[PDB]
DNA sequence: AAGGGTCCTAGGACCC
DNA sequence: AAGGGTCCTAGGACCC
């Protein structure tokens, strides 16, 4: 029943990125621009006030050297992000990505495995990696406290080969699920990591703030249930369930109320290759002329290129608009002679635009 | 490029079942009954003028002798479809169930097998098994016609094989992709077969008389194709490739003029084991009290016995109904220490009908 | 008042 | 005027 999960999470990802391809943007406060945005930047660039999705305007005002380097091509950070997961493949194959910069991996075959080749001698001397959350203490007559420590271990060597291997820098975070795996990892967030003892499981969920702070309690979940009086964890944890039920559904009832508890029984998936590919381009309505083709031709050569070196190929094709003031969407199938090319593509596009500030094209269904 | 797909498709399936099971019934006109609805009866009912789906009250007054059994529980019926995939799949593996009595199989790699096993002495002594559609005069010297009288022969050993060990009839359709051998399997309907050799495939797309009987053109289809004065298949051949797209859709139209056509480059689909598992129960608003929970319950039993039988558990439930005048819907996950029962399924499914002629319940999502 | 199936679509909620 | 992802839902079109 008892699984030892840990959850990596790189420490300011594109900005990182950015700072390795030129080395001098180390030591000076950077910040990576995607339009108006400043998606993200650099620890230096934190302790001088900006923040992680701050407008650009903002941002200069907290620190008016900030460097910007544009990060509206992904192509580089999802290179890297798949070098993460490879590494990390190599360790458990089971890894799941969630998003650019975040993997899950059950470590616990491997834990069990490295516990047998141990004597009651070897076990006595079992020590942490890193931070204990809490400042808990350890027990290691309790097996519980053992596997977790072990994972503890597992999870320096996977930053340490992150480092050594591919010069990036981030957190772990080691527990008995996913939930909490995620929650603990960002206790000590600058290159650091966390093991959470099951003992001070509440304390952690209790250390929230609000209940936005649950991953899988998302922006919409959370308007509703400050508006049912639900503010903090307790609060759900106490709340009706009928009524939690009977206002937004089982499903996400008995879900987000068993996460309010650390509880979370989901496995950790094999993520593997991608499901979808999409590119967007975004722009202050500059386009109100059907010569909106040529984005979506510039859209095309990028994703078509990413597909050819994917291997796979999809059989489905979308495009995303999105209207001045909620975003809508055309699908078809891919014709099977296209499938084995800009052309034809692009007339598709073009006929599920005119069936129609912002336009994305995604090419799925990929086999 | 060429392949030799078979279509077959059993005879009076429903009523060949439960002649089976009460030997009685043969000789005489039967017809399957499913509340109002005779769906389906045998040929002697059809030789005194009862037809497939047709009201009880008609078929009695073409046929005041029919013998009505209840069809309404396809269990048996269920059972043998499998029977006869399972044997079908004996011969090549991919094999594609289209609804309880059809089935698609690739031949191609079976037929190119045994041609390698003969001589030029062989190749001139193949003959045809069952019928040559449109009579068409067969090319020794012709490869493609060699092949697909291959087909032909190995269509009949399944025909032989379905009668020898199910003991059930059916017709066989022989052609090089699954559209003509589907439209090709009808010509000589009852327990026997037809080859569609290539020189004849205009005639058979010709001798429709209206799109609907294109497998993949349905009602909705239909009726926008003759409100837009398409009636025949030529006209749907010959109509304008923009204005069909841009009136139904790049791949509504773009499929169904390739079908117009005789061109269908679909792979034969291996179905393997089901996708979902659902039950129905219909009424004359014999439904207006929340103790509708029985027909749920009712359902529930039925359909918890299949999935238990079959091995896999699903991981979604749905609700369906109708209202008296057009179905709806709500589903949610099935919770996890279920998964592994009538009381919580009931509990879950009644919060699904208050949320919201007719009820259903499907299992879905296997794993 | 059939009684089943398969697969696609537009959208939505969540994650980063 | 971010720029990406994963997965679910209610419904619809088709097949028998
Ligand atoms: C949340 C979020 C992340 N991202 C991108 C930029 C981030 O570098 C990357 C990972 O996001 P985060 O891990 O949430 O932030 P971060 O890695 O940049 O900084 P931290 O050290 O606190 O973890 O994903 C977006 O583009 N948009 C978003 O809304
Ligand atoms: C088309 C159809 C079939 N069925 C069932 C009953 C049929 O026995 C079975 C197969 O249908 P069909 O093969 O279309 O008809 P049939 O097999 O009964 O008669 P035939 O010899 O002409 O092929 O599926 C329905 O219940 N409802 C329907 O609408
Ligand atoms: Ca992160
Ligand atoms: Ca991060
Ligand atoms: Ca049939
Ligand atoms: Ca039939």
Redesign the interface.
């Given at each position: 029943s008892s699984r030892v999960i840990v959850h990596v999470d790189l420490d300011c990802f594109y900005a990182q990125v950015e700072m390795i391809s030129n080395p001098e943007l180390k030591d000076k406060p950077l910040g990576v621009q995607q339009k108006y945005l400043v998606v993200t930047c650099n620890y230096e660039a934190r302790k001088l006030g900006v923040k992680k999705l701050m407008n650009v305007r903002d941002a200069k005002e907290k620190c008016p050297q900030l460097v910007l380097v544009n990060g509206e091509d992904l192509t580089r950070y999802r290179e890297m992000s798949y070098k993460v997961t490879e590494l990390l493949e190599e360790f458990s194959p089971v890894v799941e990505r969630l998003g650019f910069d975040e993997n899950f991996v059950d470590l616990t075959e491997m834990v069990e495995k490295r516990l047998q080749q141990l004597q009651s001698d070897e076990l006595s001397a079992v020590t942490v990696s890193g931070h204990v959350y809490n400042n808990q203490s350890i027990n290691l007559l309790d097996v519980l406290h053992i596997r977790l420590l072990v994972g503890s271990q597992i999870a320096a060597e996977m930053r340490e080969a992150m480092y050594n291997q591919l010069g990036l820098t981030g957190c772990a975070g080691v527990a008995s699920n996913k939930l909490l795996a995620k929650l603990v990892s960002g206790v000590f967030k600058p290159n650091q990591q966390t093991v959470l003892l099951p003992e001070s499981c509440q304390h952690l969920i209790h250390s929230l703030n609000h209940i936005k702070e649950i991953p899988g309690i998302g922006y919409k979940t959370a308007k509703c249930l400050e508006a049912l009086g639900i503010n903090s964890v307790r609060d759900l944890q106490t709340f009706s369930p009928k009524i939690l039920?009977?206002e937004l559904?089982?499903?996400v009832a008995?879900r987000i109320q068993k996460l309010s508890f650390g509880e979370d029984?989901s496995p950790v998936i094999l993520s593997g290759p991608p499901q979808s590919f999409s590119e967007e381009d975004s722009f202050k309505k500059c386009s109100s002329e059907v010569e909106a083709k040529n984005k979506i031709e510039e859209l095309l050569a990028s994703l078509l290129n990413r597909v050819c070196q994917d291997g796979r190929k999809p059989h489905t094709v979308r495009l995303i608009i999105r209207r001045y003031s909620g975003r809508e969407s055309r699908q078809?199938?891919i014709?099977?002679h296209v499938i084995q090319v800009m052309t034809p593509m692009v007339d598709?596009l073009m006929?599920?635009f005119?069936?129609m500030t912002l336009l994305s094209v995604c090419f799925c269904n990929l086999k």
């Open positions: 039920e009977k559904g089982i499903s008995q029984n078809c199938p014709p099977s598709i006929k599920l005119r069936n």
